[PDB]
Enzyme design. Structure first.
Site, short mmCIF file in Angstrom:
data_model
loop_
_atom_site.label_atom_id
_atom_site.label_comp_id
_atom_site.label_asym_id
_atom_site.label_seq_id
_atom_site.Cartn_x
_atom_site.Cartn_y
_atom_site.Cartn_z
N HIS B 201 0.78 -1.23 0.00
CA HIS B 201 0.00 0.00 0.00
C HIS B 201 0.81 1.28 0.00
O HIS B 201 0.27 2.36 -0.18
CB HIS B 201 -0.98 0.01 1.17
CG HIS B 201 -2.03 -1.05 1.06
ND1 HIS B 201 -2.95 -1.30 2.05
CD2 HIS B 201 -2.28 -1.95 0.07
CE1 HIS B 201 -3.72 -2.32 1.69
NE2 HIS B 201 -3.33 -2.73 0.50
N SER B 205 -0.96 -0.90 -6.32
CA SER B 205 -0.63 -1.89 -7.33
C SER B 205 0.06 -1.37 -8.58
O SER B 205 -0.01 -0.18 -8.94
CB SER B 205 -1.90 -2.63 -7.76
OG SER B 205 -2.55 -3.20 -6.65
N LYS B 227 -14.89 -8.29 -9.05
CA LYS B 227 -14.00 -9.02 -9.94
C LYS B 227 -13.30 -10.15 -9.20
O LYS B 227 -13.07 -11.23 -9.76
CB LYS B 227 -12.96 -8.07 -10.55
CG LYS B 227 -12.12 -8.75 -11.61
CD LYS B 227 -11.10 -7.83 -12.24
CE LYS B 227 -10.41 -8.52 -13.40
NZ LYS B 227 -9.48 -7.61 -14.13
N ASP B 228 -12.97 -9.92 -7.93
CA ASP B 228 -12.30 -10.93 -7.12
C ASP B 228 -13.22 -12.07 -6.70
O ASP B 228 -12.78 -13.22 -6.61
CB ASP B 228 -11.64 -10.28 -5.90
CG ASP B 228 -10.29 -9.64 -6.23
OD1 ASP B 228 -9.64 -9.08 -5.32
OD2 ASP B 228 -9.86 -9.71 -7.41
N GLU B 271 5.55 -34.31 -3.78
CA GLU B 271 4.29 -33.76 -4.27
C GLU B 271 4.60 -32.88 -5.48
O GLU B 271 5.67 -32.28 -5.58
CB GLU B 271 3.61 -32.94 -3.17
CG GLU B 271 3.10 -33.76 -2.01
CD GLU B 271 1.95 -34.69 -2.41
OE1 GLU B 271 0.89 -34.16 -2.80
OE2 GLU B 271 2.11 -35.93 -2.33
C1 HEM Z 1 0.67 -16.51 1.32
C2 HEM Z 1 1.34 -15.76 0.14
C3 HEM Z 1 0.92 -14.57 -0.47
C4 HEM Z 1 -0.25 -13.84 -0.31
C5 HEM Z 1 -1.47 -14.13 0.56
C6 HEM Z 1 -0.09 -12.68 -1.14
C7 HEM Z 1 -1.02 -11.71 -1.24
C8 HEM Z 1 -0.93 -10.63 -2.05
C9 HEM Z 1 -2.02 -9.68 -2.23
C10 HEM Z 1 -3.37 -9.67 -1.53
C11 HEM Z 1 -1.59 -8.82 -3.21
C12 HEM Z 1 -2.43 -7.75 -3.91
C13 HEM Z 1 -3.24 -8.21 -5.13
C14 HEM Z 1 -2.37 -8.80 -6.26
O1 HEM Z 1 -1.62 -8.03 -6.91
O2 HEM Z 1 -2.43 -10.04 -6.48
C15 HEM Z 1 -0.23 -9.19 -3.48
C16 HEM Z 1 0.60 -8.47 -4.28
C17 HEM Z 1 1.92 -8.76 -4.55
N1 HEM Z 1 2.58 -9.87 -4.04
FE1 HEM Z 1 1.90 -11.30 -2.95
N2 HEM Z 1 1.13 -12.67 -1.81
C18 HEM Z 1 1.71 -13.85 -1.46
C19 HEM Z 1 2.91 -14.29 -1.95
C20 HEM Z 1 3.76 -13.60 -2.78
C21 HEM Z 1 4.97 -14.12 -3.41
C22 HEM Z 1 5.49 -15.52 -3.27
C23 HEM Z 1 5.55 -13.07 -4.07
C24 HEM Z 1 6.77 -12.97 -4.79
C25 HEM Z 1 8.02 -13.80 -4.59
C26 HEM Z 1 4.61 -11.97 -3.91
C27 HEM Z 1 4.79 -10.74 -4.49
C28 HEM Z 1 3.86 -9.76 -4.56
C29 HEM Z 1 4.07 -8.53 -5.28
C30 HEM Z 1 5.37 -8.05 -5.89
C31 HEM Z 1 2.85 -7.92 -5.39
C32 HEM Z 1 2.63 -6.65 -6.23
C33 HEM Z 1 1.52 -6.80 -7.25
C34 HEM Z 1 1.54 -5.71 -8.31
O3 HEM Z 1 2.37 -5.80 -9.25
O4 HEM Z 1 0.74 -4.76 -8.21
N3 HEM Z 1 3.48 -12.33 -3.22
N4 HEM Z 1 0.15 -10.34 -2.84
C1 LIG Z 2 7.00 -34.73 4.59
S1 LIG Z 2 7.32 -35.32 2.95
C2 LIG Z 2 6.87 -34.11 1.81
N1 LIG Z 2 6.48 -32.88 2.14
C3 LIG Z 2 6.20 -32.15 0.88
C4 LIG Z 2 4.70 -31.76 0.81
C5 LIG Z 2 7.14 -30.94 0.77
C6 LIG Z 2 8.51 -31.14 0.69
C7 LIG Z 2 9.39 -30.07 0.60
C8 LIG Z 2 8.89 -28.77 0.61
C9 LIG Z 2 7.52 -28.55 0.69
C10 LIG Z 2 6.64 -29.65 0.78
C11 LIG Z 2 6.50 -33.21 -0.18
O1 LIG Z 2 6.41 -33.10 -1.37
N2 LIG Z 2 6.88 -34.32 0.50
N3 LIG Z 2 7.24 -35.54 -0.09
C12 LIG Z 2 8.55 -35.86 -0.48
C13 LIG Z 2 8.81 -37.12 -1.06
C14 LIG Z 2 10.11 -37.46 -1.46
C15 LIG Z 2 11.17 -36.55 -1.29
C16 LIG Z 2 10.93 -35.29 -0.71
C17 LIG Z 2 9.63 -34.94 -0.30
#
Ligand code: HEM
Ligand SMILES: CSC1=N[C@@](C)(c2ccccc2)C(=O)N1Nc1ccccc1
Ligand SMILES: CCCCCCCC/C=C\CCCCCCCC(=O)OC[C@H](COP(=O)(O)OCCN)OC(=O)CCCCCCC/C=C\CCCCCCCC
Ligand SMILES: CCCCCCCC/C=C\CCCCCCCC(=O)OC[C@H](COP(=O)(O)OCCN)OC(=O)CCCCCCC/C=C\CCCCCCCC
Ligand code: HEC
Ligand code: HEM
Ligand code: HEM
Ligand SMILES: CCCCCCCCO[C@@H]1O[C@H](CO)[C@@H](O)[C@H](O)[C@H]1O
Ligand SMILES: CCCCCCCCO[C@@H]1O[C@H](CO)[C@@H](O)[C@H](O)[C@H]1O
Ligand SMILES: CCCCCCCCO[C@@H]1O[C@H](CO)[C@@H](O)[C@H](O)[C@H]1O
Ligand SMILES: CCCCCCCCO[C@@H]1O[C@H](CO)[C@@H](O)[C@H](O)[C@H]1O
Ligand SMILES: CCCCCCCCO[C@@H]1O[C@H](CO)[C@@H](O)[C@H](O)[C@H]1O
Lengths: 78, 379, 241, 49, 49, 67, 59, 55, 49, 48
Positions: B201, B205, B227-228, B271
């Site tokens: 914020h 965005s 939209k969401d 997985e």
């Molecule tokens: C439990 C994980 C996450 C949640 C709940 C989350 C949630 C959100 C929300 C609510 C937004 C605003 C709406 C949108 O643009 O989609 C957002 C934006 C953003 N998130 Fe996440 N996010 C998560 C993980 C991540 C990850 C893994 C990355 C990057 C490695 C990331 C990067 C960003 C960025 C950079 C934005 C900016 C969006 C834009 O370009 O306007 N988020 N995220």
């Molecule tokens: C508790 S075993 C396990 N946890 C998961 C859900 C996981 C691993 C690593 C990171 C996030 C989630 C997955 O794929 N495996 N299985 C598995 C089977 C063979 C070799 C390695 C992992």
């Protein structure tokens, strides 16, 4: 709280109609679909290619793996 | 203040983040995954609690308490499907969320990005400890393979592992502590999400064109609230279809067999959402080398913001980068595939290729092409 | 080395997304389990009560349970005693522990069958192909004593002797007890044992789909309705000039 | 047991080969299969620990 | 949809199938002298005969 | 008496071109392997090719005749 | 004039709109369940215990 | 309903554990709300008279 | 104070007294013919004789 | 638990060996007796 201090804008007029005065999904055939095609077209050769490539590598590697499980008749000729 | 929505210390907050929040008028469907992720989180927590209320963390009762849940608890089986598949839905959404970010250069919002990476790491640890709980063959051996990765660290390795285990191998003390961790982490995820959105914020965005939208913003409600909600139901159909018509499509049948410390399954495969990373781990035949490769495969994300050479934010008007982007996506597809296969020709070589190209695209091609593109624009 | 034969896909009457289980086939399958497989295979997670309203009436179920002797106690002397079964009892184990089991099967361990169709790639297709697929080893292959040849079992040398053959039992419902008919039925029963919620799961899927179609449409319209304002919006740049 | 291209052991996880002595010959596995500390003092017995 | 989901989740906290599985217990009246009170656990609570 | 449809159908499907060809290759393998006293060869592969073709065929008809 | 009548009587006042959504859900539920339950049982005639039951019922 | 049966038993125990694990966090969250409302005015003081002249 | 409390809490996650309590197992070399490999569970991991 | 508190490890081992404890099942799925180990808990005088 941002509305009111966002940007400095001059000389722009915009016109809009109530949602009840218009159609929700208008000109499906004359406008929507023609554009969906436009969009599709303009991206297919950017996207598809690498996916096609992966698909082939997949097919090959899979077939090659199974091919190496088969018997080689030339191992028991004599 | 004349209206409560703005004066009240609590509503003020809901208003500044979900009602009067200024949003770009042109953000696409790729901007829907943020809220979907938030809903997965709330959903996973809700179903997780329901499951926790019938689960028992003891190696002699784990497997059967899960069976007791699915067989005797009213709608127990339903709640378990939703939780198990919900985790997949969560990863599908996080991968697309990340992709969107990379494509549109959202990572230029450094703090939002960095906390985003933390969220991914945390979600992964959550899945890992959560997956152990049912205590099937896959749960046990996977947990064994993973926890043993840490023994690769020189000097402290063996020490840290046995510490993590609470003994000399994955056993009951490992199970009970994993349950606690699994119960706790989702909340750290929720907490960190608040930090994520708080950094976001500061700037609002980004949008598909990568150009300032201050000249055209709209209230989050009702534009994006509607939209969401639409995006939610669209993604909810596949989820429920999978969950109700193919409950086990994505799961190893090996996990329907109580963990046996003496018999290792023929094909130990993780997985789907961890496959690509597994493939990378195996690419380097050296124990410690593979660990580093794996570590880097995810920590590389912290580096993305510093490899941006383009004078433009997004890849919308960068045809060369776009191709490079899809290669990367396809490259990840191959790694996923390679990760589900046994270590044997031709896979081993295909794997090292994909691993190698993965790091190459991100570390060299992207910044290089970005510079090359600037020159073609006469910059 | 790692040569394996994969079972074909049989058109089970419960394979379709809205296809329930054939309860007559499941009832029959129960008999096959009760009179043949249960001699070496346990089914720890199913109780006689589970049968009621599914394959048997409450009376039939009670009877089935009373046919078994279960251990209970301790009594007033701290002694364990036997008693007739109750519908709340689970199916009896053929052996006290896997050690005893192996001991009565040449060191081979007959797995519990409660989740066998989900614990094996191929599910009923694999269980069917295995039951009806024994045959003599091909040239160059020698099965060690105690094992039997089965191309469907990994390694091809299983420790389970063919369990079923024509008329190895008589379906009290009159169905012609042929080996394949038997395999087919028990496999159906096994699918049930593994996922008792199978049917209800599919009835829900049906509703899920209908409600989803409806709701997705209604919400699509509403999203389009609200956004129409911006979608058709027009603008112009009129600098003073 | 009794597998691998060395007549010893073969680990199905990432393909580590061991000889009939338990040593690492092929694969990723760093060292040899640990040899527990045991004594033979016991006719037709073996006290390991 | 909400009414159903909430109904399902709510009921997942009420007596499960195994718990509702209820039986009877027989007690020989020749183990209780005239005036005695013997207690037998049953359906959770104590059974007074 | 009593006849298991699986037998009937199996015999029918073994008449199939794919089965016949496979069956043919199998017997050839069996023959040569059986005739030698120092060969590593085995006819698992040809057996599978056969069983695979036969059984895929069986699958389509078998249940029609079962109850 | 259903849309017109509907609007004035049900959709105009926010209160009436809510009562309409409640009774609507009530009627919808009853009808949707029975209908869906039929469609399902029809697609599975003769396979449910509902169908087989009579053969062994003998209370 | 709360018991998950006809008396305090195992299903009561496992659900109580989950609740006990969860609530402390609801306490932490609500504490933030507590402190948030508090900061609207800052602390009261032993004399009950405004302290704006001496903070 | 901090060093001690952290040290205490940390070590509460390492092997507890019951786990460290480790014994030996005797195996008669009679059930093992020449050429065979028998596995015995032991101290968690498999024991190969 | 006695070791280093009231008895030496040797004394403790002896104390435990004075008791017979049930173990198994064995290769036949049979329960058998064996001498005690310091890791064993004090013997119950009654089964229940
Ligand atoms: C439990 C994980 C996450 C949640 C709940 C989350 C949630 C959100 C929300 C609510 C937004 C605003 C709406 C949108 O643009 O989609 C957002 C934006 C953003 N998130 Fe996440 N996010 C998560 C993980 C991540 C990850 C893994 C990355 C990057 C490695 C990331 C990067 C960003 C960025 C950079 C934005 C900016 C969006 C834009 O370009 O306007 N988020 N995220
Ligand atoms: C508790 S075993 C396990 N946890 C998961 C859900 C996981 C691993 C690593 C990171 C996030 C989630 C997955 O794929 N495996 N299985 C598995 C089977 C063979 C070799 C390695 C992992
Ligand atoms: C990680 C683990 C990997 C697991 C497997 C990955 C899943 C693979 C499934 C494919 C996903 C479907 C994507 C197809 C979308 C096709 C499409 O529309 O592309 C063209 C379209 C054109 O947009 P504009 O340039 O703005 O032009 C509009 C008008 N001017 O591009 C986009 O939609 C933007 C790209 C966002 C999609 C990102 C999704 C990729 C997901 C996988 C993970 C990748 C990232 C990890 C990096 C480290
Ligand atoms: C038998 C079943 C009994 C049901 C009991 C529940 C009773 C609930 C009734 C509450 C009253 C509802 C009336 C709301 C009135 C507010 C309003 O303005 O309408 C909603 C208002 C519409 O605005 P206008 O078109 O401008 O209307 C103005 C008319 N003068 O906002 C909306 O669009 C909201 C409605 C859409 C719902 C979105 C949900 C979609 C999501 C799908 C997931 C499925 C659900 C699963 C739930 C799981 C929960 C754990
Ligand atoms: C005399 C005991 C006996 C009977 C009776 C018997 N089984 Fe088994 N079964 C075994 C044994 C022993 C194994 C172990 C095979 C192995 O692992 O080598 C086994 C294994 C199995 C397996 C698969 C094991 C795997 O790894 O794929 C299935 C499925 C199975 N039996 C089904 C049945 C069914 C259904 C029946 C009744 C129609 C049946 N069995 C009757 C002894 C029996
Ligand atoms: C980020 C959110 C969550 C994710 C990604 C997640 C993921 C998972 C996964 C991968 C499983 C294994 C499913 C299986 O059996 O195959 C699992 C199990 C479990 N989860 Fe979660 N979970 C989340 C949150 C929670 C929460 C908050 C709780 C409880 C307060 C919880 C409780 C459980 C329980 C009890 C199990 C074991 C029973 C079972 O396996 O079905 N989970 N979870
Ligand atoms: C987990 C429980 C609670 C926590 C952590 C908590 C924490 C705090 C904190 C940090 C303050 C500021 C410092 C102070 O004045 O002491 C505060 C103030 C206050 N809290 Fe709490 N509180 C809790 C429970 C309660 C309860 C039970 C009440 C009353 C029913 C209460 C009433 C107040 C009020 C009215 C103040 C104003 C103090 C003033 O006069 O300036 N608190 N609380
Ligand atoms: C209710 C939904 C909340 C989503 C989390 C968004 C973050 O954080 C910010 O802190 C400020 C100071 O307290 C508030 O004024 C802002 O409204 C709030 O968004
Ligand atoms: C006092 C009110 C008692 C009502 C009993 C509710 C019983 C719920 O009955 C349910 O009906 C569904 C539809 O046929 C089935 O699919 C479920 O398996 C079944 O449990
Ligand atoms: C957007 C997804 C909406 C899903 C709503 C579908 C409601 C599920 O319907 C369920 O069907 C079962 C089978 O008859 C019943 O036993 C349950 O009581 C009922 O709630
Ligand atoms: C470090 C925890 C501090 C307490 C949280 C107070 C936050 C509410 O504080 C408000 O923003 C002012
Ligand atoms: C105000 C907080 C004071 C905390 C200081 C208490 C430090 C106690 O320290 C403890 O003393 C024990 C006695 O020998 C040792 O066995 C423990 O290892 C040590 O951590």
């Amino acid at each position: 709280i941002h509305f009111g201090n966002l940007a400095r804008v001059r000389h722009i007029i915009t016109y809009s109609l109530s949602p009840f005065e218009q159609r929700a999904i208008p000109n499906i055939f004359s406008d929507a679909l023609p554009n969906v095609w436009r969009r599709f077209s303009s991206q297919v050769f950017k996207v598809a290619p690498p996916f096609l490539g992966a698909y082939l590598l997949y097919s090959w590697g899979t077939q090659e793996f199974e091919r190496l499980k088969r018997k080689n008749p030339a191992d028991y000729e004599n | 203040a004349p209206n409560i929505r703005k004066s009240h210390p609590l509503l003020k907050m809901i208003n500044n983040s979900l009602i009067d929040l200024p949003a770009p008028s042109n953000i696409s469907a790729w901007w829907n995954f943020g809220s979907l992720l938030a809903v997965c989180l709330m959903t996973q927590i809700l179903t997780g609690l329901l499951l926790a209320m019938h689960y028992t963390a003891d190696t002699s009762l784990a497997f059967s308490s899960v069976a007791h849940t699915c067989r005797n608890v009213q709608y127990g089986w339903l709640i378990r499907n939703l939780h198990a598949n919900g985790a997949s839905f969560f990863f599908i959404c996080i991968f697309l969320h990340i992709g969107r970010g990379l494509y549109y250069g959202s990572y230029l919002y450094k703090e939002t990005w960095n906390t985003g990476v933390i969220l991914l790491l945390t979600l992964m640890a959550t899945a890992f400890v959560g997956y152990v709980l049912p205590w099937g063959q896959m749960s046990f051996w996977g947990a064994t393979v993973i926890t043993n990765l840490f023994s690769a660290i020189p000097y402290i390795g063996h020490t840290l592992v046995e510490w993590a285990w609470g003994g000399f191998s994955v056993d009951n003390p490992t199970l009970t502590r994993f349950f606690a961790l699994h119960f706790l982490l989702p909340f750290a995820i929720a907490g960190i999400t608040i930090i994520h959105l708080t950094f976001l914020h500061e700037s609002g965005s980004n949008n598909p064109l990568g150009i300032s939208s201050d000249s055209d913003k709209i209230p989050f409600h009702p534009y994006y609230s509607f939209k969401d909600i639409l995006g939610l139901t669209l993604m909810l159909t596949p989820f429920l279809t999978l969950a109700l018509f193919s409950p086990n499509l994505l799961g190893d049948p090996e996990n329907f067999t109580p963990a046996n410390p003496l018999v290792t399954p023929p094909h130990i495969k993780p997985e789907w959402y961890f496959l690509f990373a597994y493939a990378i781990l195996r690419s380097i035949p050296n124990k410690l080398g593979g660990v580093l490769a794996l570590a880097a495969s995810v920590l590389i994300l912290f580096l993305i913001p510093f490899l941006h050479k383009s004078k433009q934010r997004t890849m919308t008007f960068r045809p060369l980068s776009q191709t490079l982007f899809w290669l990367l996506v396809a490259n990840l597809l191959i790694l996923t595939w390679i990760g589900s296969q046994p270590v044997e020709h031709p896979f081993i070589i295909i794997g090292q290729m994909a691993s190698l190209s993965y790091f190459t695209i991100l570390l060299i091609l992207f910044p290089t092409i970005g510079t090359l593109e600037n020159k073609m624009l006469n910059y | 080395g790692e040569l394996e034969l994969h079972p074909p896909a049989f058109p089970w009457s419960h394979g379709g997304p809205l296809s329930a289980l054939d309860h007559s086939s499941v009832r029959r399958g129960f008999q096959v389990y009760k009179q043949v497989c249960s001699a070496c295979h346990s089914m720890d997670y199913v109780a006689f009560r589970n049968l009621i309203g599914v394959t048997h009436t409450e009376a039939e179920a009670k009877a089935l349970a009373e046919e078994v002797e279960v251990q209970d106690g301790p009594d007033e002397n701290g002694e364990l005693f036997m008693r007739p079964g109750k519908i709340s009892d689970y199916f009896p184990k053929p052996y006290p522990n896997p050690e005893a089991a192996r001991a009565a099967n040449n060191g081979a361990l007959p797995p519990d069958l409660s989740y066998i169709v989900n614990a094996r790639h191929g599910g009923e297709d694999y269980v069917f192909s295995l039951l009806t697929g024994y045959c003599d080893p091909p040239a160059g292959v020698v099965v060690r004593e105690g094992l039997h040849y089965n191309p469907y079992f990994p390694g091809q040398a299983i420790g389970m002797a063919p369990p079923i053959y024509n008329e190895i039992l008589e379906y009290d419902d009159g169905t012609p007890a042929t080996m394949s008919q038997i395999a087919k039925d028990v496999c159906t029963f096994l699918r049930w044992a593994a996922e008792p919620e199978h049917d209800q799961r599919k009835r829900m899927g049906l509703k899920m789909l209908l409600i989803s179609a409806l709701l997705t449409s209604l919400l699509y319209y509403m999203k389009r309705h609200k956004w129409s304002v911006l979608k058709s919006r027009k603008m112009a740049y009129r600098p003073p000039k | 047991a009794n597998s691998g291209d060395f007549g010893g052991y073969y680990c199905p996880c990432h393909g580590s080969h061991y000889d009939a002595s338990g040593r690492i010959r092929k694969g990723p596995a760093p060292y040899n299969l640990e040899v527990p500390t045991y004594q033979f003092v016991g006719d037709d017995l073996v006290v390991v620990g | 949809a909400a009414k159903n989901v909430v109904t399902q989740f709510i009921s997942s906290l009420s007596a499960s199938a195994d718990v509702l599985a209820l039986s009877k217990i027989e007690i020989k009246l020749s183990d209780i002298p005239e005036g005695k009170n013997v207690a037998f656990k049953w359906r959770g609570k104590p059974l007074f005969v | 008496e009593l006849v298991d449809p699986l037998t009937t159908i199996r015999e029918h499907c073994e008449q199939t071109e794919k089965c016949v060809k496979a069956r043919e290759r199998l017997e050839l393998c069996d023959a040569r392997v059986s005739s030698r006293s120092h060969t590593e060869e085995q006819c698992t592969e040809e057996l599978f090719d056969f069983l695979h073709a036969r059984d895929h065929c069986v699958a389509h008809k078998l249940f029609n005749k079962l109850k | 004039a259903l849309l017109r009548q509907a609007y004035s009587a049900l959709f105009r006042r926010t209160s009436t709109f809510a009562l309409t959504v409640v009774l609507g859900a009530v009627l919808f539920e009853r009808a949707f369940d029975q209908g869906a339950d039929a469609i399902f049982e029809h697609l599975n005639e003769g396979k449910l215990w509902k169908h087989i039951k009579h053969k062994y019922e003998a209370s």
